[PDB]
RNA sequence: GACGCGACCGAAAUGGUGAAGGACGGGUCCAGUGCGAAACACGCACUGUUGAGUAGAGUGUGAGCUCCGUAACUGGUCGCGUC
């Protein structure tokens, strides 16, 4: 019954502003203290911010302090951080946690959100390319082909891919996302097929991503010789 | 000072119906204010345990807490199927709040080679001017592997960048994708693209190579 | 010995006075632990080994005690009066 759910994530430019929202529903944060975490992809955990009850006392980890402020609506019964001269560093999921009642479970953060994703960054939202990896023209290594998508050159963050509307799913690997040189991000998706069903059967990979309104499907063949 | 919580080790390999032991380590005294959480890929945290040795509630008792001065050790008796995964530690003695770095779970298995598979780039990516050769490893353990990029047999590299998925939940293996990146006018000054792949599980080096512009 | 008067002593009490710091306490101060939906701030409880400046980091006509007084008395002693 207790939730917490953030929302206020999204692009912003270096040195930009943003405000997260906390939205809490099963309890009432005025009896409890919030903190705010953040990971950035790939990595750990990071402590960044908390409010304490009845006080207001606020506490800010070194690398934000300055920066960023958390505050508490109780009328809403929601908590923010507002996120001033945002930096790249900064790029991260940020979860709302709340820290239980201290007879139950001490100072443990017993109920967190599932985050929403903040991309700090100079450039500017743009659609995927979907290239085909087609299976190889010899036989295969195995006993299966492999053939996939290359979704490149896409920003910011995140992209769906699915293999025949969602019906394939055994033997799909699809990649986390690497971030270019260029700023954009890429990834492929890839599935392993028999080898002799490759020219009777149908192997689509659908691409979503939202940011930019771009929704692709491309139908994945062997080529020529 | 802020306080330091050192988490060791970084990842472990284990079997279901292991033992096994997570270590974190303060940088000065944190009484018994430190929780462990758990987190899968994709999802927010969840509490294990309290004030150093308090088991949350609802958490299964084969998850223990311990305290030895200022070194605090999260202990699963029997490893289940369900708990694979990361474990942090953190402290709440002072603020800054402090989170230890991470221990990865992973399970243990028999050493399986890849599957190499290698793509040359669509025509429809040379038309822009960019050329992105792939190579896939498939399905094997250990995650540890090596790829090797060769341009009409020069070894490539700061070309490429390599991602890897999650271990699988059905047979435990990894998957491993790295991408060359040229430019067009580049990608047409040479003939053979090869990936070449060394693995533990893999008796010699494997090359798979394509001819620019053969079928 | 009784009655009576006085002085001296004692004296419950009391006005003023000024030293003592955690072994007089505290609604003094500091710290720690637990509790209050509560890490700080606020409140309660508890534990503190130079906890800790003796009259103030105090806004106690605080207790006790020192020193100078005063003192109920239905206490003692001595003198004197009457028998
Ligand atoms: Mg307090």
């Known amino acids: 019954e207790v939730q917490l759910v953030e929302s206020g994530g999204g692009l912003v430019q270096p040195g930009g502003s943003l405000r997260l929202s906390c939205a809490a529903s099963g309890f009432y944060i005025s009896y409890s203290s919030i903190h705010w975490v953040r990971q950035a992809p790939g990595k750990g955990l990071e402590w960044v911010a908390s409010i304490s009850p009845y006080s207001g006392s606020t506490y800010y980890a070194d690398s934000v302090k300055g920066r960023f402020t958390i505050s508490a609506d109780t009328s809403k019964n929601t908590a923010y951080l507002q996120m001033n001269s945002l930096r790249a560093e900064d790029t991260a999921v940020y979860y709302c946690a709340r820290q239980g009642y201290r007879r139950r479970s001490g100072r443990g953060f017993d109920y967190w959100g599932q985050g929403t994703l903040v991309t700090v960054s100079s450039a500017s939202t743009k659609g995927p390319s979907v290239f085909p990896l087609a299976p190889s023209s010899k036989s295969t290594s195995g006993g299966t082909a492999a053939l996939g998508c290359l979704v490149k050159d896409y920003f910011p963050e995140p992209v769906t891919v699915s293999w025949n509307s969602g019906a394939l799913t055994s033997g799909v690997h699809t990649f986390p996302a690497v971030l270019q040189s260029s700023g954009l991000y890429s990834l492929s998706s890839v599935v392993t097929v028999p080898s002799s069903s490759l020219g009777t059967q149908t192997y689509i990979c659908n691409v979503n991503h939202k940011p930019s309104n771009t929704k692709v499907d491309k139908k994945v063949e062997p080529k020529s010789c | 000072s802020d306080i330091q919580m050192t988490q060791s080790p970084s990842s472990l390999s284990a079997s279901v119906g292991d033992r096994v032991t997570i270590t974190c380590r303060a940088s000065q ?122 341009v009409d047999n020069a070894l490539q590299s700061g070309n490429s960048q390599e991602s890897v998925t999650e271990q699988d939940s059905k047979d435990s293996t990894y998957s491993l994708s790295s991408t060359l990146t040229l430019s067009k006018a580049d990608y047409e000054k040479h003939k053979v693209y090869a990936c070449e792949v060394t693995h533990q599980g893999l008796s010699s080096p494997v090359t798979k190579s394509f001819n620019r512009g053969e079928c």
Do not use: H, M
């Not at chain 2, 490893?79 to 399970?107: M, R």
């Not at chain 2, 298995?109 to 040379?126: G, H, K, M, N, Y």
């Open chain 2, 29 to 150: 005294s944190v009484s018994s204010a430190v929780a462990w959480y758990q987190q899968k890929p994709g999802k927010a945290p969840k509490l294990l345990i309290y004030s150093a040795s308090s088991l949350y509630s609802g958490v299964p008792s084969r998850f223990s807490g311990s305290r030895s001065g200022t070194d605090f050790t999260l202990t699963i008796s029997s490893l289940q199927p369900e708990d694979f995964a990361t474990y942090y530690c953190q402290q709440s003695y002072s603020f800054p709040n402090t989170f230890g770095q991470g221990t990865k779970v992973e399970i243990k298995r028999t050493v399986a080679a890849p599957s190499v598979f290698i793509f040359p780039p669509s025509d429809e990516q040379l038309k822009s001017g960019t050329a992105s050769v792939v190579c896939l490893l498939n399905n094997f353990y250990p995650r540890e592997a090596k790829v090797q990029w060769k």
